[PDB]
């Protein structure tokens, strides 16, 4: 399309690698620079490497390496997936979220502003944030709801700065928000792959608290397609929600995976301490992204988890 | 009320030193730990040193020094004024706002959470941030408007993190927002003291852009009083506006200070580049603070500036 050289931050990770493999198989003209710090949730084997795919090892906070990359590889598009992932009950956990999600995003934006040649800065965000739209003008966000935990506050803070680069300097940003993603290439510490891999290794499923927490789950293939559509067709400066209706509690998910595994839910569940923080996901609409022509292609959650269960059976040794 | 041992971040700066002197003068049994990095806008001469006031030199990002200070000095209250001030048109300027305003605030909140014995975390913010309430009667903020520049974006980011510590962990936070403050102890780089010191040093007044940008100006004595009142009587978790009706353009202010200096406006004014970013300030009310029993004691702007002009004549050699 209007993409020749793209910098995919976090391209060794779960969503980043799914996006990189989608672009490399759809658009054989596009040079893809995977920019990634290579931490434990990352894997070279997530990406189908070819003569278009190159790896740059670095932190998004590395101003000088980023400036070198944008100028020397003539980057037209940043696709920013490099957000912090690891949640735990230990002191300073949320600080790493601010350092990567707020400060790291900000370094990328300022580099982009100094470079001055970007055609698009695509920022990936989550349903931890709820953008309220102008009742006058539904293309326009006026406010974000107050996050209830510091993890979610770093996501809101990142979105405010990204948008401010467009409103102040005309940096060409687009933000997308996504539900919880499931699919191939996810390190098994998030619910679905952790439970699948636990069920494959004979072990019990850790239920934090009551197991009544609810998420919406969207397939990685539907996400990769939505991002592709928004990058190529989206209105610069706008935010796109990539939501589905596919809401399950933690216990609902345990039930489905136990059913797929041929084992009884009761005697698989071990109850474990709750997270210490307020953990609220928003139902986000998908009307704007549908008007771009996006259609959810993986609607049968049960059927997709059967396939993914078998994918981890073959591939989990990778992690 | 509750204040015995207080940690005042940025207490060598403009608003912080005015607050320290106020607490020292009004109470006789509050120990004040002035916590400050000693940047060029700070002065030890700003503080009236006594038996109850001690300087700890430190960055608010210094987790281990903060943790030693909270625990060994049995701090009950943090009064957090250490925000980044220095605006210019230079690359990377806004990055230091994220490091101090977002990451620094977050270090203080996480230290406070780990310490577990704070009675109050007071966060000083600005009229660059505006929030919307749930209902007139409950007056709880449920959203922040989207900021139009990255400077304001960092102030919004800080407020989201501060509030989330109350909402997730019951950290006892109060936020206050302020108009532009004027008074003693300000480094001459903000409008009023820069113009007063330029008039005294016989130099030209720099008008950035058109000089039609407007601010509201509140006296530091009125701000220190409001912060004391909010700390002792405010509802934990809420935000309070500290803000008068005292609106003036840059050119309105230049004219008042030229009149006071005994000089003609024409021939004092040099026109210099505008700031590169979009800056509009939300008009705030002071009803919530009036209900706690605050009353603006310094209402006569020109009268206060005549006195402030006199104070810089005597004391500006400090800077
Ligand atoms: N996974 C989900 O369910 C979900 C839901 C909504 C949207 N998102 C968004 O998707 C993006 C990626 O999520 P994911 O699940 O694929 O995560 P992941 O942890 O699998 O991938 C993140 C990648 O970024 C890299 N990284 C981390 N910090 C970095 C830094 N400072 N510099 C450079 N590289 C760094 C890691 O090495 C990793 O490869 C995030 O921006 C997040 O906001 C996540
Ligand atoms: N208005 C609000 O008023 C508050 C204070 O404004 P002001 O006009 O008095 O500012 P000022 O610039 O006059 O004072 C700020 C003080 O904070 C200190 N400081 C800055 N960054 C620091 C850091 N990382 N760690 C420790 N100390 C640090 C500076 O040395 C200075 O003494 C701000 O929070 C702002 O939101
Ligand atoms: C990984 C995991 C998650 N959970 C719960 C915590 C959350 O309510 C939910 C999803 O957690 P997780 O997959 O970590 O996702 P998120 O980043 O959206 O919080 O599953 C468990 O109960 N046990 C587990 O082993
Ligand atoms: C310091 C200064 C400010 N200004 C303008 C910039 C702003 O529009 C206004 C106030 O600036 P400033 O005092 O820096 O306050 P704020 O942090 O709220 O921006 O005065 C000048 O025109 N010349 C100057 O020399
Ligand atoms: Ni190179």
UniProtKB/Swiss-Prot annotation, chains A, B:
Its EC number is 4.2.1.46. One of its GO terms (biological process) is nucleotide-sugar metabolic process. It catalyses: dTDP-alpha-D-glucose = dTDP-4-dehydro-6-deoxy-alpha-D-glucose + H2O. InterPro entries: dTDP_Gluc_deHydtase, NAD(P)-bd_dom, NAD(P)-bd_dom_sf. Keywords: Lyase, NAD. Its cofactor is NAD(+). Substrate binds at residue 126. The active site is at residues 127-128, 151. GO terms for molecular function: dTDP-glucose 4,6-dehydratase activity. Belongs to the NAD(P)-dependent epimerase/dehydratase family. dTDP-glucose dehydratase subfamily. This is Putative dTDP-D-glucose 4,6-dehydratase. It comes from Acanthamoeba polyphaga mimivirus (APMV).
